[PDB]
mmCIF file of C-alpha atoms and ligand atoms in Angstrom:
data_model
loop_
_atom_site.group_PDB
_atom_site.id
_atom_site.type_symbol
_atom_site.label_atom_id
_atom_site.label_comp_id
_atom_site.label_asym_id
_atom_site.label_seq_id
_atom_site.Cartn_x
_atom_site.Cartn_y
_atom_site.Cartn_z
ATOM 1 C CA UNK A 4 14.476 22.988 33.146
ATOM 2 C CA UNK A 5 12.441 19.628 33.612
ATOM 3 C CA UNK A 6 13.003 16.085 32.478
ATOM 4 C CA UNK A 7 13.281 12.964 34.121
ATOM 5 C CA UNK A 8 16.957 13.559 35.006
ATOM 6 C CA UNK A 9 18.429 13.613 39.073
ATOM 7 C CA UNK A 10 18.380 17.332 38.916
ATOM 8 C CA UNK A 11 15.014 18.383 36.722
ATOM 9 C CA UNK A 12 12.776 15.242 37.849
ATOM 10 C CA UNK A 13 9.636 14.896 39.014
ATOM 11 C CA UNK A 14 10.492 16.390 42.896
ATOM 12 C CA UNK A 15 11.846 19.231 41.260
ATOM 13 C CA UNK A 16 9.138 20.292 39.142
ATOM 14 C CA UNK A 17 6.887 22.120 41.891
ATOM 15 C CA UNK A 18 9.606 25.141 41.746
ATOM 16 C CA UNK A 19 8.409 26.373 38.673
ATOM 17 C CA UNK A 20 4.943 24.814 38.804
ATOM 18 C CA UNK A 21 3.714 24.887 42.043
ATOM 19 C CA UNK A 22 0.396 23.365 41.192
ATOM 20 C CA UNK A 23 2.270 20.360 41.251
ATOM 21 C CA UNK A 24 1.329 20.318 44.609
ATOM 22 C CA UNK A 25 -2.251 21.014 43.725
ATOM 23 C CA UNK A 26 -5.376 18.990 45.183
ATOM 24 C CA UNK A 27 -6.057 17.280 41.482
ATOM 25 C CA UNK A 28 -2.788 15.905 40.101
ATOM 26 C CA UNK A 29 -2.196 12.953 38.253
ATOM 27 C CA UNK A 30 -1.110 10.324 38.343
ATOM 28 C CA UNK A 31 -2.368 8.188 41.169
ATOM 29 C CA UNK A 32 -2.530 4.689 42.715
ATOM 30 C CA UNK A 33 -5.667 2.738 41.572
ATOM 31 C CA UNK A 34 -6.615 1.166 44.894
ATOM 32 C CA UNK A 35 -8.759 -1.694 43.344
ATOM 33 C CA UNK A 36 -10.566 -2.231 46.314
ATOM 34 C CA UNK A 37 -11.739 1.162 47.371
ATOM 35 C CA UNK A 38 -12.591 1.894 43.431
ATOM 36 C CA UNK A 39 -16.440 2.285 43.343
ATOM 37 C CA UNK A 40 -19.034 0.886 40.738
ATOM 38 C CA UNK A 41 -20.685 3.578 39.530
ATOM 39 C CA UNK A 42 -23.482 2.108 37.545
ATOM 40 C CA UNK A 43 -24.506 5.131 35.932
ATOM 41 C CA UNK A 44 -21.643 5.620 33.740
ATOM 42 C CA UNK A 45 -21.574 4.812 30.380
ATOM 43 C CA UNK A 46 -19.786 2.828 28.022
ATOM 44 C CA UNK A 47 -17.342 4.716 26.814
ATOM 45 C CA UNK A 48 -17.645 5.341 22.900
ATOM 46 C CA UNK A 49 -14.390 4.872 21.177
ATOM 47 C CA UNK A 50 -14.991 6.500 17.446
ATOM 48 C CA UNK A 51 -11.680 6.259 15.723
ATOM 49 C CA UNK A 52 -12.754 4.931 12.446
ATOM 50 C CA UNK A 53 -11.787 8.216 10.431
ATOM 51 C CA UNK A 54 -8.695 8.832 12.085
ATOM 52 C CA UNK A 55 -5.679 10.904 10.347
ATOM 53 C CA UNK A 56 -2.885 10.303 11.786
ATOM 54 C CA UNK A 57 0.265 12.992 10.291
ATOM 55 C CA UNK A 58 3.133 12.982 12.138
ATOM 56 C CA UNK A 59 5.479 11.421 14.664
ATOM 57 C CA UNK A 60 7.284 13.755 16.700
ATOM 58 C CA UNK A 61 10.385 13.305 19.606
ATOM 59 C CA UNK A 62 9.784 16.502 21.833
ATOM 60 C CA UNK A 63 12.699 15.619 24.449
ATOM 61 C CA UNK A 64 10.574 14.067 26.702
ATOM 62 C CA UNK A 65 8.517 11.250 24.684
ATOM 63 C CA UNK A 66 7.511 10.828 21.215
ATOM 64 C CA UNK A 67 3.812 11.754 19.769
ATOM 65 C CA UNK A 68 1.985 10.743 17.262
ATOM 66 C CA UNK A 69 -0.177 13.175 15.854
ATOM 67 C CA UNK A 70 -3.761 13.654 14.612
ATOM 68 C CA UNK A 71 -5.670 16.101 12.680
ATOM 69 C CA UNK A 72 -8.075 17.143 14.731
ATOM 70 C CA UNK A 73 -9.736 20.234 12.947
ATOM 71 C CA UNK A 74 -13.324 18.027 12.120
ATOM 72 C CA UNK A 75 -14.804 15.056 14.468
ATOM 73 C CA UNK A 76 -12.799 12.213 12.911
ATOM 74 C CA UNK A 77 -11.332 10.348 15.472
ATOM 75 C CA UNK A 78 -13.867 11.219 19.160
ATOM 76 C CA UNK A 79 -14.319 9.955 22.486
ATOM 77 C CA UNK A 80 -17.480 10.043 24.503
ATOM 78 C CA UNK A 81 -19.387 8.432 26.865
ATOM 79 C CA UNK A 82 -18.386 6.925 30.064
ATOM 80 C CA UNK A 83 -18.105 10.055 32.523
ATOM 81 C CA UNK A 84 -17.824 12.086 29.365
ATOM 82 C CA UNK A 85 -20.379 15.034 28.499
ATOM 83 C CA UNK A 86 -20.141 16.004 24.774
ATOM 84 C CA UNK A 87 -16.872 15.326 22.494
ATOM 85 C CA UNK A 88 -13.521 15.044 23.258
ATOM 86 C CA UNK A 89 -10.970 15.001 19.406
ATOM 87 C CA UNK A 90 -7.923 13.198 19.507
ATOM 88 C CA UNK A 91 -4.878 15.159 19.251
ATOM 89 C CA UNK A 92 -2.174 12.697 19.732
ATOM 90 C CA UNK A 93 -1.173 9.981 21.528
ATOM 91 C CA UNK A 94 2.039 9.078 23.308
ATOM 92 C CA UNK A 95 4.030 6.514 25.589
ATOM 93 C CA UNK A 96 5.392 6.783 29.165
ATOM 94 C CA UNK A 97 8.014 3.596 29.722
ATOM 95 C CA UNK A 98 10.724 2.488 32.020
ATOM 96 C CA UNK A 99 14.221 1.628 31.522
ATOM 97 C CA UNK A 100 13.309 -2.065 33.533
ATOM 98 C CA UNK A 101 9.850 -4.007 32.577
ATOM 99 C CA UNK A 102 9.406 -3.443 36.227
ATOM 100 C CA UNK A 103 8.632 0.051 36.271
ATOM 101 C CA UNK A 104 7.633 2.415 33.355
ATOM 102 C CA UNK A 105 3.573 3.115 34.237
ATOM 103 C CA UNK A 106 2.636 6.400 35.631
ATOM 104 C CA UNK A 107 -0.796 5.542 36.799
ATOM 105 C CA UNK A 108 -0.082 1.819 39.468
ATOM 106 C CA UNK A 109 -2.947 -0.544 40.081
ATOM 107 C CA UNK A 110 -2.708 -1.597 43.940
ATOM 108 C CA UNK A 111 0.790 0.190 44.245
ATOM 109 C CA UNK A 112 1.672 -2.199 40.744
ATOM 110 C CA UNK A 113 3.935 -0.531 38.017
ATOM 111 C CA UNK A 114 3.476 -1.902 34.258
ATOM 112 C CA UNK A 115 6.250 -1.400 31.872
ATOM 113 C CA UNK A 116 4.452 1.516 30.357
ATOM 114 C CA UNK A 117 1.388 3.459 29.424
ATOM 115 C CA UNK A 118 -0.244 4.985 26.582
ATOM 116 C CA UNK A 119 -1.892 7.826 26.909
ATOM 117 C CA UNK A 120 -4.536 8.951 24.138
ATOM 118 C CA UNK A 121 -5.176 12.823 24.622
ATOM 119 C CA UNK A 122 -8.554 14.277 23.762
ATOM 120 C CA UNK A 123 -10.131 17.529 24.086
ATOM 121 C CA UNK A 124 -13.571 18.959 24.649
ATOM 122 C CA UNK A 125 -14.614 20.351 21.489
ATOM 123 C CA UNK A 126 -16.780 23.075 23.255
ATOM 124 C CA UNK A 127 -13.550 24.958 23.519
ATOM 125 C CA UNK A 128 -13.020 25.300 20.346
ATOM 126 C CA UNK A 129 -9.019 24.096 20.322
ATOM 127 C CA UNK A 130 -6.332 22.352 22.708
ATOM 128 C CA UNK A 131 -4.835 25.617 24.178
ATOM 129 C CA UNK A 132 -8.276 26.986 25.333
ATOM 130 C CA UNK A 133 -9.159 23.310 26.389
ATOM 131 C CA UNK A 134 -6.346 23.229 29.119
ATOM 132 C CA UNK A 135 -7.740 26.066 30.717
ATOM 133 C CA UNK A 136 -10.656 24.250 31.769
ATOM 134 C CA UNK A 137 -11.700 21.666 34.413
ATOM 135 C CA UNK A 138 -12.816 19.366 32.044
ATOM 136 C CA UNK A 139 -11.064 20.424 29.017
ATOM 137 C CA UNK A 140 -9.060 17.161 28.670
ATOM 138 C CA UNK A 141 -9.956 13.314 28.433
ATOM 139 C CA UNK A 142 -6.979 10.806 28.338
ATOM 140 C CA UNK A 143 -7.427 7.411 27.952
ATOM 141 C CA UNK A 144 -4.556 5.675 29.268
ATOM 142 C CA UNK A 145 -3.748 1.877 28.660
ATOM 143 C CA UNK A 146 -1.453 -0.197 30.519
ATOM 144 C CA UNK A 147 1.084 -2.036 28.908
ATOM 145 C CA UNK A 148 2.709 -5.335 29.616
ATOM 146 C CA UNK A 149 5.726 -7.240 28.286
ATOM 147 C CA UNK A 150 4.595 -10.628 26.795
ATOM 148 C CA UNK A 151 3.342 -11.445 23.149
ATOM 149 C CA UNK A 152 3.904 -8.153 20.243
ATOM 150 C CA UNK A 153 1.363 -5.988 19.553
ATOM 151 C CA UNK A 154 0.621 -6.194 16.131
ATOM 152 C CA UNK A 155 -0.790 -2.615 15.964
ATOM 153 C CA UNK A 156 2.172 -0.821 17.533
ATOM 154 C CA UNK A 157 4.785 -2.654 15.021
ATOM 155 C CA UNK A 158 4.644 0.386 12.508
ATOM 156 C CA UNK A 159 5.160 3.008 15.584
ATOM 157 C CA UNK A 160 7.978 1.319 16.565
ATOM 158 C CA UNK A 161 9.893 0.790 12.960
ATOM 159 C CA UNK A 162 9.662 4.596 12.520
ATOM 160 C CA UNK A 163 11.648 5.330 15.751
ATOM 161 C CA UNK A 164 14.853 5.116 14.143
ATOM 162 C CA UNK A 165 14.037 8.508 12.002
ATOM 163 C CA UNK A 166 13.012 10.581 15.285
ATOM 164 C CA UNK A 167 15.568 9.425 17.400
ATOM 165 C CA UNK A 168 16.284 12.460 18.927
ATOM 166 C CA UNK A 169 14.539 15.793 20.159
ATOM 167 C CA UNK A 170 13.558 18.191 17.350
ATOM 168 C CA UNK A 171 12.965 15.348 14.623
ATOM 169 C CA UNK A 172 9.719 14.659 13.318
ATOM 170 C CA UNK A 173 8.581 12.116 10.304
ATOM 171 C CA UNK A 174 5.591 11.689 8.250
ATOM 172 C CA UNK A 175 3.066 9.132 10.163
ATOM 173 C CA UNK A 176 -0.254 9.206 8.084
ATOM 174 C CA UNK A 177 -2.722 6.277 7.674
ATOM 175 C CA UNK A 178 -1.884 5.110 11.317
ATOM 176 C CA UNK A 179 -4.937 3.280 13.144
ATOM 177 C CA UNK A 180 -4.609 3.940 16.656
ATOM 178 C CA UNK A 181 -7.440 1.262 17.327
ATOM 179 C CA UNK A 182 -4.808 -1.413 17.230
ATOM 180 C CA UNK A 183 -3.493 -0.159 20.213
ATOM 181 C CA UNK A 184 -6.246 -1.065 22.422
ATOM 182 C CA UNK A 185 -6.984 -4.268 24.480
ATOM 183 C CA UNK A 186 -10.252 -6.247 24.055
ATOM 184 C CA UNK A 187 -12.284 -5.045 26.944
ATOM 185 C CA UNK A 188 -13.233 -1.399 27.761
ATOM 186 C CA UNK A 189 -13.661 -1.672 31.229
ATOM 187 C CA UNK A 190 -11.941 1.641 33.081
ATOM 188 C CA UNK A 191 -11.682 3.810 36.099
ATOM 189 C CA UNK A 192 -11.807 7.544 35.927
ATOM 190 C CA UNK A 193 -11.235 10.366 38.178
ATOM 191 C CA UNK A 194 -10.508 14.061 37.797
ATOM 192 C CA UNK A 195 -6.675 14.748 37.486
ATOM 193 C CA UNK A 196 -4.055 16.728 35.685
ATOM 194 C CA UNK A 197 -1.668 16.447 33.003
ATOM 195 C CA UNK A 198 1.324 14.634 34.089
ATOM 196 C CA UNK A 199 4.031 16.895 32.737
ATOM 197 C CA UNK A 200 4.395 20.502 33.011
ATOM 198 C CA UNK A 201 2.375 22.788 33.024
ATOM 199 C CA UNK A 202 0.455 20.229 35.171
ATOM 200 C CA UNK A 203 -2.603 21.943 34.518
ATOM 201 C CA UNK A 204 -5.478 20.511 36.092
ATOM 202 C CA UNK A 205 -7.571 20.011 33.118
ATOM 203 C CA UNK A 206 -7.927 16.187 32.411
ATOM 204 C CA UNK A 207 -10.822 13.522 32.939
ATOM 205 C CA UNK A 208 -8.612 10.003 33.288
ATOM 206 C CA UNK A 209 -10.729 7.189 32.020
ATOM 207 C CA UNK A 210 -7.680 4.344 33.020
ATOM 208 C CA UNK A 211 -8.680 0.656 31.260
ATOM 209 C CA UNK A 212 -8.611 -2.233 33.423
ATOM 210 C CA UNK A 213 -7.030 -4.688 30.979
ATOM 211 C CA UNK A 214 -3.497 -3.945 29.713
ATOM 212 C CA UNK A 215 -2.221 -4.771 26.336
ATOM 213 C CA UNK A 216 0.726 -6.876 25.896
ATOM 214 C CA UNK A 217 3.488 -5.962 23.832
ATOM 215 C CA UNK A 218 7.113 -7.755 23.287
ATOM 216 C CA UNK A 219 10.588 -7.344 24.683
ATOM 217 C CA UNK A 220 11.765 -6.078 21.377
ATOM 218 C CA UNK A 221 8.923 -3.686 20.745
ATOM 219 C CA UNK A 222 9.764 -1.763 24.340
ATOM 220 C CA UNK A 223 13.732 -2.426 23.426
ATOM 221 C CA UNK A 224 13.009 -0.137 20.727
ATOM 222 C CA UNK A 225 11.543 2.409 22.732
ATOM 223 C CA UNK A 226 14.860 2.801 25.127
ATOM 224 C CA UNK A 227 16.912 3.406 21.604
ATOM 225 C CA UNK A 228 15.194 6.815 21.797
ATOM 226 C CA UNK A 229 17.001 10.102 23.083
ATOM 227 C CA UNK A 230 16.243 12.774 25.332
ATOM 228 C CA UNK A 231 18.815 15.061 23.887
ATOM 229 C CA UNK A 232 19.408 16.715 20.694
ATOM 230 C CA UNK A 233 21.387 15.322 17.679
ATOM 231 C CA UNK A 234 25.193 16.332 18.384
ATOM 232 C CA UNK A 235 24.546 16.852 22.242
ATOM 233 C CA UNK A 236 25.404 14.110 24.860
ATOM 234 C CA UNK A 237 23.181 11.146 24.488
ATOM 235 C CA UNK A 238 20.860 10.383 27.258
ATOM 236 C CA UNK A 239 18.763 7.338 26.578
ATOM 237 C CA UNK A 240 15.010 8.333 26.870
ATOM 238 C CA UNK A 241 13.810 6.163 29.435
ATOM 239 C CA UNK A 242 11.922 6.353 32.884
ATOM 240 C CA UNK A 243 10.098 9.378 31.656
ATOM 241 C CA UNK A 244 7.293 8.803 33.800
ATOM 242 C CA UNK A 245 5.951 10.824 36.939
ATOM 243 C CA UNK A 246 5.207 8.686 39.774
ATOM 244 C CA UNK A 247 1.644 8.748 41.792
ATOM 245 C CA UNK A 248 0.499 11.476 43.346
ATOM 246 C CA UNK A 249 -1.605 12.127 46.709
ATOM 247 C CA UNK A 250 -5.176 11.105 46.100
ATOM 248 C CA UNK A 251 -6.524 14.108 48.215
ATOM 249 C CA UNK A 252 -10.456 14.684 48.148
ATOM 250 C CA UNK A 253 -10.996 12.565 45.476
ATOM 251 C CA UNK A 254 -12.692 9.181 44.667
ATOM 252 C CA UNK A 255 -11.532 6.737 42.048
ATOM 253 C CA UNK A 256 -15.009 5.514 40.149
ATOM 254 C CA UNK A 257 -15.159 2.034 38.552
ATOM 255 C CA UNK A 258 -17.451 1.163 35.142
ATOM 256 C CA UNK A 259 -17.046 -2.579 36.002
ATOM 257 C CA UNK A 260 -18.168 -4.557 38.763
HETATM 258 CU CU1 CU B 301 13.956 23.327 30.022
HETATM 259 CU CU1 CU B 302 1.541 11.265 28.870
#
């Protein structure tokens, strides 16, 4: 009823999810010149040392690498955040070509892909309760550009053959998400939403300024995935990104000058 095709893509989602035309939708274009430095922001605290990855799942729109979120094992704190946010899963959005794929844009520039590390606020007890709150989630977004390989991505790329089609999953233990981060934690932040239906306005977005580099071969493997289930007509899982939405009454803040 929703996807990324011609007939069910972003431009249609409002029919079933009227919040698509809401006041704090994501992604947005990040106008670097109009973002303002906020000296009172903190440094981000990314605490992933005890992360417990469990599984990787092709859900028909992306693949999610899922984590044990039943304890404070892999948490995000600081920055604009009040309290502790637990990592539940990460996934990517990517293009059919290297010139598109990201959801956020930077001065209208599209990156080849975007990584979303999804975290929920522990004050709300579980993910499903957190998405109903204005400060329920914190998503760390990281741009991908094509160049050198990202070594810490390779273990993800190499399991993708085992989850080609919608509904397939595979064990994915002992994966360290720290290997997906860039050097700098400088960031922009703003209040927004989930970027897939149900498009709930529950996200504090934290978008890193510094992209990571991945190789051609790595992104090419993303593009071999399928939106369809096994035994259905093959449709490559590409261009699974929502375009930039109106900023409306929001200001994007920068952690850096
Ligand atoms: Cu559907
Ligand atoms: Cu996402």
